[PDB]
Amino acid sequence: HYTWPRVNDGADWQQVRKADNWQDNGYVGDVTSPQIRCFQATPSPAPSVLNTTAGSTVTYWANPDVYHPGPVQFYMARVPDGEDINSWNGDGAVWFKVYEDHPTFGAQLTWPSTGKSSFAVPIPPCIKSGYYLLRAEQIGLHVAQSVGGAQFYISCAQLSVTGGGSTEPPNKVAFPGAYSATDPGILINIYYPVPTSYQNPGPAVFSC
Numbered sequence: 001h002y003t004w005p006r007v008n009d010g011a012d013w014q015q016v017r018k019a020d021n022w023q024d025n026g027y028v029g030d031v032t033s034p035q036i037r038c039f040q041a042t043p044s045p046a047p048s049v050l051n052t053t054a055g056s057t058v059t060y061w062a063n064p065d066v067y068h069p070g071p072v073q074f075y076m077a078r079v080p081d082g083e084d085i086n087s088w089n090g091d092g093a094v095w096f097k098v099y100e101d102h103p104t105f106g107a108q109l110t111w112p113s114t115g116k117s118s119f120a121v122p123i124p125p126c127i128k129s130g131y132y133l134l135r136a137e138q139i140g141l142h143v144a145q146s147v148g149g150a151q152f153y154i155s156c157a158q159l160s161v162t163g164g165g166s167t168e169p170p171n172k173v174a175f176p177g178a179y180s181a182t183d184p185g186i187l188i189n190i191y192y193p194v195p196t197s198y199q200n201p202g203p204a205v206f207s208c
């Protein structure tokens with residue numbers, strides 16, 4: 001139970017759209033629901049935007065700290081030049097993955113997110129300049145052996161990216177749409193038998 005309330009030096013929900021779990025630190029359990037995107041049953045803009053440049057790093061904060069076993073992943077979606085980031089919600093297949101972590105294999109799985117509050121998110125240096133939505137995600141798999149058991153902790157930040165390139169991320173996906181309740185990385189028993197491989201749900205990470 002944790003939220004993803006801030007980016008860089010900003011305050012709670014300042015550049016981050018207020019997630020529906022800002023009070024209860026709850027999670028999203030239905031990969032077909034509207035909340036799977038930005039944890040908002042009804043889209044609502046964040047009061048501010050975070051300025052950053054392509055090639056730099058954005059720090060996404062979890063509160064208190066990620067403690068359920070599972071992967072952390074980040075996605076981005078570009079706002080069209082003719083739209084306003086305060087009212088563009090990222091409908092359709094416009095999201096591309098920019099980061100994902102992998103567990104370490106042994107008698108039991110260890111995750112590189114466990115106990116961390118600060119996460120370094122790399123903004124591809126080649127993507128086109130413009131406003132973007134940055135989706136933070138952590139999937140808790142401690143009771144994911146049954147359909148609908150995985151627990152999604154999400155939020156979306158509003159960014160202004162300058163100095164980019166002209167490379168367009170291929171195979172973009174939608175939320176909902178990118179995940180299936182039976183994906184091997186979502187419906188899984190991480191305890192027995194201990195997995196020796198792990199397939200992160202969603203598309204491949206985009207790299208320049």
Ligand SMILES: *[C@@H]1O[C@H](CO)[C@@H](O)[C@H](O)[C@H]1NC(C)=O
Pocket residue numbers: 051160
């Ligand atoms: C962020 O960039 C915008 C331009 O889109 C600018 O208006 C704003 O002042 C910048 N924020 C600051 C002061 O860092």
Ligand SMILES: [Zn+2]
Pocket residue numbers: 001002068
């Ligand atoms: Zn929890």
